[PDB]
């Protein structure tokens, strides 16, 4: 009979088209079935990089470190290399522009003891916060696979994580990336200088498709391939037009 | 001193371009200033038509008539003229397709006493539910102006209405219409066979512009002008590209 996970290697064409290597993982919520071009890489655990902004946001909201999605976190006045980081931000814009320094301040306020306890409650990856509490997701010991990202995102979608419903609703709002009459995408990018991520889901009228992709990213010039390759898979599968 | 409200008649060109007549009202939240092509019509009261799906959804959620945005309202099996109504719906899709029969059922469950009490608590328009409990917003006594729509929507945006924060967040989610890297639109269309409405807001990185427009709508052929004319005003004012 049918399997929980199927391999579709035809999606490899979308990686080889760009001389790139990686994995796309899809989960059809109605059918309770998953699909990927590479089951082994789908289960390989990597640093989450800025995809960690999802759980970090949830913890900061639930503890009151972030009061709501409108609270302003003033620029600290240090000019950094990414121009969009050199301004005031709220939770919405800090997630949109992947503003590391804002989330580093959240993490310090959360603190190591509460961060570790909450990642255990979330069943998040290897739950390991070794390194600094304000950088472990960029250069520390935490590791999560694409299928683990799907599992976490499905709990978030269903308000099943061990934080308040309010915190989960706010973070799902902050994840909003694209919407039109055909679909809604809620997602988060990540990049660690070695691999790039895009994780999230596509809401349709009568189904949800969760996705998690990562790919080798030797330079930042290819960052747009995260979304472009994912969308080629979504188009091939008739999920988006 | 500066003016809270200013008239810009140059926007009339966008109405005359289509041989149409109406009003667009904009509110700049950061500046606390409003703009319209027609101050008189901005403050005249009309049937809300399907824009009433905003308060109707809030009331149904807060009273528990609708449990959440996933609860399914099964099609009653009556084939209606609008094909998208002839299927099962949830709150998200019922708002997207303006599914009148679903909201008529909500209104009957809410009932006259609680509907009247909640519109009073909302300061919604003339607060008058005279007519049929399941059609007064289409052919009964309720009336609201475009400026009153803005005031109501501002309260919703700030979670200041007299229902739970949860109900307000769910309805704001259901209002999602369009999103990209430049803006997010949360809005609701309306149409009563005589007047057309579009009301909602545009979220930018550092500001939000509320809008409410209505226009004479003698035929359904021109329904797309509600968004088209509004977007021409938004583009003229450099709110969207
Ligand atoms: Cl949303």
Residue numbers in the entry:
A (entry chain B), B (entry chain A): 21 to 261
What does the literature reporting this entry say, word for word?
The OXA-48 carbapenemase is widely disseminated in Enterobacterales, necessitating new treatments for producer strains. OXA-48 is a class D SBL that uses a nucleophilic serine (Ser70) to hydrolyse β-lactams, with a proximal post-translationally carbamylated lysine (Lys73) proposed to act as the general base for both the acylation and deacylation steps of the reaction. Diazabicyclooctane (DBO) inhibitors, including avibactam and nacubactam, act on a wide range of enzymes to overcome β-lactamase-mediated resistance. Here we describe investigations on how avibactam and nacubactam inhibit OXA-48 and two variants, OXA-163 and OXA-405, with deletions in the β5–β6 loop neighbouring the active site that modify activity towards different β-lactam classes.
Nacubactam is distinguished from avibactam by an extended C2 substituent bearing a 1-aminoethoxy group. Both OXA-163 and OXA-405 have four amino acid deletions within the β5–β6 loop, including of residue Arg214. OXA-163 also has a single amino acid substitution (Ser212Asp) adjacent to the deleted region. Crystal structures were obtained for OXA-163 and OXA-405, as uncomplexed enzymes and in the nacubactam- and avibactam-bound forms. Both OXA-163 and OXA-405 assemble as homodimers in the asymmetric unit. Consistent with their high overall sequence identities, they adopt very similar overall folds and active site arrangements compared to OXA-48. The exception is the Ser70 nucleophile, which is in dual conformations in one of the two chains in the crystallographic dimers of uncomplexed OXA-163 and OXA-405. The respective protein backbones only differ at the β5–β6 loop, which is truncated in the cases of OXA-163 and OXA-405, compared to OXA-48.
